[PDB]
Amino acid sequence: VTLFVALYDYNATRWTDLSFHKGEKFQILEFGPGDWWEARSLTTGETGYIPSNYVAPVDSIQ
Amino acid sequence: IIGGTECKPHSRPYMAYLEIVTSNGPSKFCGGFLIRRNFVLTAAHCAGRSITVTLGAHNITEEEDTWQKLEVIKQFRHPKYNTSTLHHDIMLLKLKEKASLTLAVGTLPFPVPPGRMCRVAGWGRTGVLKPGSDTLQEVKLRLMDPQACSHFRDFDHNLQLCVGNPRKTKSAFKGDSGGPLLCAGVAQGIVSYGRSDAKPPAVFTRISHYRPWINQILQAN
């Protein structure tokens, strides 16, 4: 319930945010507080905020 | 800290190094500062599952007799913190035990016009593509008019300070979050966020706004 996948590319503008490519997977560390979620990239190992509207849950969308 | 210099060891005795255990994977790190024997101030975005604070450090990879390494028992993240805007990026950490006040470990006193020179310290990256620093670094930065932060969509001058002359490369950066901005020897700001490319200014939480909230937490705990 914490494994999510990027639907689009994203270039971070704040240093607290992750950049990512479409198809990149994440473990969500916190679903907020707000519309950006704290996540760890399973590609890079880095942690940061990602916009929640750019990701979808992996297990249910196959 | 980009564009700064290594601190004289133990010359900034309020500085705290935070190691934060996350829900998944390895820990993250942040700065912070001791404000009471059992309270550390930092940024809200440094929260996690559990936090260990190291006080008395210079080189964070070299244990010394000055170290006091303490577990956090309670995280008091500002209740209006929001990840979209990063407003209210402030958190108080209650330590499991009180720190011993020594020459190497102490509290930072509290009491600000644009144009004045301030200082910030941390273990963060020393350039955009550089690793964090093992040693505590510090840099002198100019407090800017809020207009200098106009490109930050969610900047709010009542809540935040705009810090760092944009014509220089000097700045706080990744890993420095939570550290204090000192102007004339007293805490005025907390490192919050800035551009991914490290071009100043960066955005700092304006401590003065949060004094009532801090005081209520301190009085109750």
Q: Which of B24, B174, B195 sits opposite A40 (nearest CB)?
A: B24
Question: Would you give the DSSP letter of residue A14?
Answer: B
State this model's resolution in angstroms: 1.4
Are B83 and A33 inside 8 Å of each other by CB? yes
Q: Which residues contact B70 (CB under 8 A, 6 or more apart)?
A: B52, B53, B54, B55, B95, B96, B97, B99
Q: Which CATH fold would you assign to the domain B13-107+209-221?
A: Thrombin, subunit H (2.40.10)
φ/ψ of residue B49, rounded to 5: -70, -40
Cα–Cα distance, A14 to B221 (Å, whole number)? 34
Residue whose pair of structure tokens reads 């559990």 in the numeric block: B50
For the B1-12+108-208 domain, the top CATH level (class) is mainly beta
Q: What is the chain A residue with the closest CA to B45?
A: A16
Cα–Cα distance, A3 to A6 (Å, whole number)? 10
Are B196 and A34 inside 8 Å of each other by CB? no
Domain boundaries, chain A: 1-62
Are B196 and A29 inside 8 Å of each other by CB? no
Residue numbers in B near A13 (CB within 8 A): 195-196
Are B196 and A12 inside 8 Å of each other by CB? yes
Q: What is the 3-state secondary structure (H, E, C) of chain B?
A: CECCEECCCCCCCCEEEEEEECCCCCCEEEEEEEEECCEEEECHHHCCCEEEEEECCCECCCCCCCCEEEEEEEEEECCCCCCCCCCCCCEEEEECCCCCCCCCCCCCCCCCCCCCEEEEEECCECCCCCCECCECEEEEEEEECHHHHCCCCCCCCCCEEEECCCCCCCECCCCCCCCEEEECCEEEEEEEECECCCCCCEEEEEHHHHHHHHHHHHHHC
**Residues in a beta bridge with A49:** A17, A38
Joined tokens for residue B167: 């014509």
Under 8 Å between Cβ of A46 and A15: no
Q: Which residues contact B182 (CB under 8 A, 6 or more apart)?
A: B108, B118, B119, B120, B188
Helices then strands, counting H and E runs in chain A, come out as 0, 5
Q: CATH homologous superfamily for A1-62?
A: SH3 Domains (2.30.30.40)
Catalytic residue among B78, B87, B89, B176: B89
Task: Locate CATH 2.40.10.10 in chain B.
Answer: 1-12+108-208, 13-107+209-221
φ/ψ of residue A8, rounded to 5: -140, 160
